[PDB]
Amino acid sequence: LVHVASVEKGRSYEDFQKVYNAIALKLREDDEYDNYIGYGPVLVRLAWHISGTWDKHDNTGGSYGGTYRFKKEFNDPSNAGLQNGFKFLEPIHKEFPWISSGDLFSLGGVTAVQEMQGPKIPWRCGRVDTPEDTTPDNGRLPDADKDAGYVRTFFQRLNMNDREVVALMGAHALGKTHLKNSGYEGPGGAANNVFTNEFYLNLLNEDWKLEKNDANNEQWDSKSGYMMLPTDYSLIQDPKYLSIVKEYANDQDKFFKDFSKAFEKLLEDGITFPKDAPSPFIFKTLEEQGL
Numbered sequence: 001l002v003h004v005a006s007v008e009k010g011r012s013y014e015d016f017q018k019v020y021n022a023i024a025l026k027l028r029e030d031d032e033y034d035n036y037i038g039y040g041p042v043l044v045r046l047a048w049h050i051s052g053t054w055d056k057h058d059n060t061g062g063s064y065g066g067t068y069r070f071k072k073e074f075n076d077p078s079n080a081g082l083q084n085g086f087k088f089l090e091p092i093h094k095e096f097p098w099i100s101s102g103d104l105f106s107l108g109g110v111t112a113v114q115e116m117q118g119p120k121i122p123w124r125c126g127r128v129d130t131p132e133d134t135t136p137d138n139g140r141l142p143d144a145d146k147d148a149g150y151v152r153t154f155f156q157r158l159n160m161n162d163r164e165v166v167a168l169m170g171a172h173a174l175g176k177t178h179l180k181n182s183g184y185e186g187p188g189g190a191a192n193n194v195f196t197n198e199f200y201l202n203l204l205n206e207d208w209k210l211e212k213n214d215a216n217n218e219q220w221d222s223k224s225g226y227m228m229l230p231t232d233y234s235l236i237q238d239p240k241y242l243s244i245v246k247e248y249a250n251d252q253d254k255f256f257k258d259f260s261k262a263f264e265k266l267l268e269d270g271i272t273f274p275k276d277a278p279s280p281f282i283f284k285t286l287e288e289q290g291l
């Protein structure tokens, strides 16, 4: 399967910076969502789940085709709760009907991270919508109730290595688990709509307790009111993972730099970019624009 990036006709940096600003302006406006967390965390989760279907072996799945717009992927049990990120973006797609679905879902994730004061993420245009029959089947996204060997093995399919996996998981400092979506409940920290390295700090400094929640699932709970998933706590159980966790709890700039590279790579897996294709765009935030 080859998927070649095709820039939307005649579009350039300024067009996509207009779509960025539209998403970012609505993130500021619709602030009440999920008890004032706002839409940013569900939008970086949506960009991860449309990319996380990729399989390196046959180049199926991935962010290129925008296939989450089809019922099979929209109704995947693993995507429960992401309909709220879709409905947030649907106004903006009506306003810029020329951007492809893959591009709009991935730029929403980029915009949310930078607007929640994360690192800049280089983003590239050119994903092309593909037919309903290209939609990957349910079951390619990871279970939460498993251990470190499962996480390592699952992420080899998206060929991410240990460092990349640990840098990507730092995004679980954002938002929260919702019992009616996943059977898990609670936030992982106090700053859950500002991008920081707090996931790593909480993992190493809190007093975790294995408890059973109302959906009868086990999760790691702390006195402070935070929770960690079994696959999250996995990172301090494995010796290779645990020493990268310590590296990111001791250096927030290295965390930001490595997250930026692994999230771009995540979003680009499966796509062939021609050598005459434009460079990756670095978008300015509303704040850097005085907007």
Ligand code: HEM
Pocket: 041, 042, 044, 045, 048, 080, 081, 142, 143, 144, 145, 151, 168, 169, 171, 172, 174, 175, 176, 177, 178, 179, 181, 182, 183, 184, 229, 231, 263
């Ligand atoms: C083995 C890996 C992973 C598993 C099992 C997993 C699982 C989960 C689960 C069960 C939730 C709760 C969903 C809900 O109830 O609403 C969640 C939320 C979230 N995850 Fe993951 N995740 C994984 C990796 C990642 C990665 C790599 C990213 C992003 C780079 C990510 C970003 C998020 C975000 C931002 C949320 C919060 C959503 C919200 O607030 O609504 N996840 N994760």
Ligand SMILES: C[n+]1ccsc1
Pocket: 172, 173, 174, 175, 176, 177, 186, 187, 188, 227, 228, 229, 232
């Ligand atoms: C620990 N955690 C927070 C959001 S998803 C998992």
